[PDB]
Amino acid sequence: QSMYDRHLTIFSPDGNLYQIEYAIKAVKNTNITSVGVKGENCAVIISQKKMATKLLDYNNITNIYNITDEIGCSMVGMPGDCLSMVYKARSEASEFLYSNGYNVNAETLCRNICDKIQVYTQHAYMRLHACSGMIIGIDENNKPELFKFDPSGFCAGYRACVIGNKEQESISVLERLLEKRKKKIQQETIDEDIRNTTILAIEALQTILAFDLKASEIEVAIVSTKNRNFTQISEKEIDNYLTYIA
């Protein structure tokens, strides 16, 4: 029947915003996943490089967008809504420099994005932005930071999180992968986090996607200390890390 989900600013009898609820299903319907995990003095984002459901140049299609030279982020969901969200973030992070001098913090960037998102929720101005992403980046405290935001307002932040269509089949796997490094050996920190976290990150993606995970269909980025650049790891290093599973 004609239920109460027509507009976006109208509550339901039980009290649920169904326009927001349907917008989260838009991200789960794009069948594009991504994993983000923060370890010691580093954090990485693993993309998937797939068309949001011939002759397409695969180097152009991606799900990683640097907001600044220090704060990078990923995007999923509808390709139209995710592109405009980066521009509503690049024009915001750069605005922080012109209005406050310092570079924007990773935790302040996500909370400032959610403030604009919440405004479009209470008002019937525009449609919701069917997207999600993992904002990555280190701060002035020399600590890595990761933050995930849903189509609604959220500044959760996780040490390891999965965004995409498989969030209901990955917490049972990421908890074990995180446990495979925290309560395990944990010897020292020889600044070899790439061989310690990213190896224990790509392994998490292989446990989610049952494919062989071709190196020409995956691209990661690191924002660790001594680098500080959100550099996209080259193809040769990606294929080299894929053979480390043996």
Partner 1 sequence: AGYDLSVSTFSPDGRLYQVEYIYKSINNNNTALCLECKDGIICCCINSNMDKNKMIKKNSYNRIYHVNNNIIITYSGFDGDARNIIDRARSEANTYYYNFHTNIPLHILVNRISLYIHAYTLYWHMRPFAASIIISSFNEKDKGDIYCIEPNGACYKYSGIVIGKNKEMFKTEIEKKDYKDINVRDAIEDIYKFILTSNNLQNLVNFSWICKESSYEFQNIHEEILTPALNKA
Partner 2 sequence: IKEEYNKFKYDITKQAIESLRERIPKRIIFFNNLVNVNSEPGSILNVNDLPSHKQIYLELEKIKTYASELIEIIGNIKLWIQLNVPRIEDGNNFGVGIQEEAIQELARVEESAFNLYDAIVKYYMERAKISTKVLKYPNVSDYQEAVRELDEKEWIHIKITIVDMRNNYIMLYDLLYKNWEKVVKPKNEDAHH
Partner 3 sequence: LTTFSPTGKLVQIEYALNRVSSSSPALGIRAKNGVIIATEKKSPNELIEENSIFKIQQISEHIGIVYAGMPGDFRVLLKRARKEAIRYSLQYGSEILVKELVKIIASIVQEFTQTGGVRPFGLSLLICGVDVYGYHLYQIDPSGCYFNWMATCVGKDYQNNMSFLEKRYNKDIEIEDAIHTAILTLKESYEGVLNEKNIEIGVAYDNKPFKILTQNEIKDYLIE
Binding footprint of partner 3 on the chain (CB under 8 A): 8-17, 107, 111, 114-115, 117-119, 121-124, 147, 152-161, 171, 174-175, 178
Residue 127, binding choice from partner 1, partner 2, partner 3, none, Cβ under 5 to 8 Å by partner class: partner 1
Q: Does 11 bind partner 1 (CB under 8 A)?
A: no
Q: How far is the CB of 72 from partner 3 (least distance, A)?
A: 19
> In this structure, what token pair is assigned to residue 226?
């001594």
Angle at 45 between CA 205 and CA 20, to 5 degrees: 90
Minimum Å gap between C-beta 218 and partner 3 is 22
Nearer CB in complex with partner 2: 53/141? 53
Note the helical H segments in 4-77: 18-28
Instruction: Count residues binding partner 1 (CB under 8 A).
Output: 37
Is 79 a binder of partner 1 (CB under 8 A)? yes
Helix (H) or strand (E) holding 83: helix 79-100
The burial of 60, by beta-carbon neighbours within 10 Å (0-12 exposed, 13-18 middle, 19 or more buried), is given as exposed
Residue 34: strand, helix, or coil: strand
From the CB of 53, what's the least distance to partner 3, in Å?
27
Q: Do 38 and 159 form a contact (C-beta atoms < 8 A)? A: yes
Kindly state the smallest distance separating residue 95's Cβ from partner 3, in Å: 16
Beta strand 131-138 pairing with 76-77? antiparallel
Query: Taking CB under 8 A as the rule, which mask of x and - marks residues 29-58 in contact with partner 1?
Result: x---------------------xx-xxxx-
Angstrom distance (rounded) from CA 91 to CA 79: 19
Q: For the beta carbon of residue 72, count every other beta carbon within 10 angstroms.
A: 24
Secondary structure (3-state) at 197: helix
Whose structure tokens read 């935790």? 107
232 is a site residue for partner 1 (CB under 8 A): no
Q: Does 128 bind partner 1 (CB under 8 A)?
A: yes
Find out whether 28 and 170 touch, Cβ atoms under 8 Å: no
Cβ within 8 Å of residue 203, ≥6 positions away: 177, 245
Task: Give the range of 96-104, 119-127, 140-148, 222-230 binding partner 1 by CB under 8 A.
Answer: 119-127
Give yes or no for residue 26 binding partner 1 (CB under 8 A): yes
C-beta closer to partner 2: residue 17 or 199:
17
Specify the residue, 179 or 235, whose C-beta has the smaller distance to partner 3. Answer: 179
- Could you tell me the two tokens for 47? 């993309």
Q: Which residues bind partner 2 (CB under 8 A)?
A: 3-5, 12-14, 16, 18, 21-22, 50-53, 168
Contact residues for partner 1 (CB under 8 A)?
1-3, 5-6, 8, 18-19, 22-23, 25-26, 28-29, 51-52, 54-57, 59-61, 78-81, 83-84, 87, 124-130
